[PDB]
Amino acid sequence: STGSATTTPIDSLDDAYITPVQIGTPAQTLNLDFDTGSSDLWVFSSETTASEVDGQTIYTPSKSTTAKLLSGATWSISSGDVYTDTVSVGGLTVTGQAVESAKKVSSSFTEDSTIDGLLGLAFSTLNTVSPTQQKTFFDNAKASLDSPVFTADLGYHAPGTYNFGFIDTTAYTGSITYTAVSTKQGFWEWTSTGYAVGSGTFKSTSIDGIADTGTTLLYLPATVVSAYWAQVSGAKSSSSVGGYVFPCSATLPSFTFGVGSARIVIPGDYIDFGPISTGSSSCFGGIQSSAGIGINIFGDVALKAAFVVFNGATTPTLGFASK
């Protein structure tokens, strides 16, 4: 089996991407945030505190003939109980998928009406269901997939594609470079071989990080991020804003990261996240320091510059191609 679904930016900044997902019988279609940095499938539901719902499409398990309460199971990340139900992505169907129903949701989600929930695609060891931990959609699908892979092809200010079970050889240029993955923290964790700023020379240096479609920006060590922003006239780190900002009049340099011997180039425009407030001439930067995070994160800024293969074979790997 295979599946293929279009993913769409939620706003003009590519702050996140939503992908339609069919849940239940008859289908209830929710727009979920596919997140390779977490491992829960959770949704706004008919059980979510009414005050905390503001425009989202909710999952109603009582209207689904295939929904079953997973008795005693709870989750907490935003929290609630758990159902099993039929879940389909882009034509690919999983039966008995754990669907985690929000009783309560953070204010951050209530405020963002375009995201109906999350679909986690990290390793199932990070799943928060208790007392019986649950499998991700990908893990459940693996048995039936033609190949145990999914690919992320995120667009820049444009729709993209998530594919399951196959690699679309028309979707990238050149070859896919594969690199080792550590699952020890439950993430798609890998080691970049270095970086370059604009047309500058490539610096060979190991950067351990995660491929995280659920994170908007690129978070790298302070040394690297300082070298980048030093090439932008007027750029500075602002404690009031919470990161690097730059004059909206600036032209940003590209940023290159290494994948083995290969190179992925992030165009400068990808690093522009626009005015910090309406009318401001200060703009927010898309490359930020990981120093207060504890881990480097190859978020959407980096990932959308590439065709990315998440290989969930017994020895997992990550592949990157230019496109």
Side-chain angles (χ1 to χ4, degrees), residues 1-50 52-62 64-67 69-102 105-106 108-110 112-134 136-141 143-183 185-235 237-294 296-323:
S1 67
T2 60
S4 180
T6 297
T7 192
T8 306
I10 61 165
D11 61 23
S12 68
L13 301 178
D14 296 341
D15 279 317
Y17 298 76
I18 47 176
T19 308
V21 180
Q22 281 69 48
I23 307 180
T25 309
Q28 304 179 33
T29 297
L30 276 67
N31 299 328
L32 309 181
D33 186 352
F34 282 25
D35 182 8
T36 64
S38 66
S39 308
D40 290 49
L41 196 173
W42 74 259
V43 296
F44 282 73
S45 69
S46 51
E47 304 176 332
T48 310
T49 316
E52 301 184 330
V53 180
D54 183 78
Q56 291 84 2
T57 291
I58 61 168
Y59 167 61
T60 313
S62 69
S64 171
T65 59
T66 43
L69 179 75
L70 190 60
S71 184
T74 61
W75 60 283
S76 184
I77 298 178
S78 294
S79 63
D81 38 34
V82 183
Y83 295 82
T84 57
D85 208 339
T86 299
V87 174
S88 300
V89 177
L92 166 72
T93 299
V94 167
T95 59
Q97 173 67 42
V99 177
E100 301 171 33
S101 169
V105 78
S106 182
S108 297
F109 298 96
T110 296
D112 184 16
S113 61
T114 73
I115 295 175
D116 298 328
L118 264 71
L119 191 144
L121 293 168
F123 294 87
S124 295
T125 53
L126 292 179
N127 177 264
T128 72
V129 177
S130 169
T132 307
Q133 199 172 39
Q134 298 297 301
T136 68
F137 173 83
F138 180 48
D139 270 354
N140 281 326
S144 69
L145 295 175
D146 292 357
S147 175
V149 302
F150 67 90
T151 62
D153 179 13
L154 300 183
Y156 167 67
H157 296 157
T161 304
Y162 282 103
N163 291 329
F164 293 83
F166 74 102
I167 292 170
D168 181 355
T169 54
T170 73
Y172 58 88
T173 56
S175 48
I176 304 178
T177 296
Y178 289 87
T179 194
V181 163
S182 171
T183 60
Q185 288 187 92
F187 297 118
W188 292 91
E189 187 176 353
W190 63 293
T191 302
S192 170
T193 47
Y195 72 100
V197 173
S199 59
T201 61
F202 185 86
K203 174 81 165 169
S204 290
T205 179
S206 297
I207 301 172
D208 182 281
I210 65 169
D212 181 5
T213 59
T215 288
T216 309
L217 308 180
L218 170 57
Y219 295 86
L220 295 171
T223 50
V224 177
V225 177
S226 183
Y228 179 79
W229 287 108
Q231 297 303 311
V232 183
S233 295
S237 185
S238 162
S239 52
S240 49
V241 184
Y244 284 91
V245 299
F246 67 94
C248 292
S249 57
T251 296
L252 299 178
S254 64
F255 183 90
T256 300
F257 64 94
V259 185
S261 56
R263 308 287 179 250
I264 299 297
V265 181
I266 305 168
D269 286 348
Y270 289 29
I271 300 160
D272 178 6
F273 278 73
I276 59 178
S277 303
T278 301
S280 178
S281 67
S282 294
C283 276
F284 198 75
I287 292 173
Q288 298 291 346
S289 174
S290 65
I293 289 186
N296 300 304
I297 303 176
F298 295 85
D300 295 335
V301 164
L303 298 183
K304 73 196 184 182
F307 178 86
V308 188
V309 178
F310 295 76
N311 172 25
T314 292
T315 300
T317 61
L318 272 168
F320 293 82
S322 293
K323 65 190 184 183

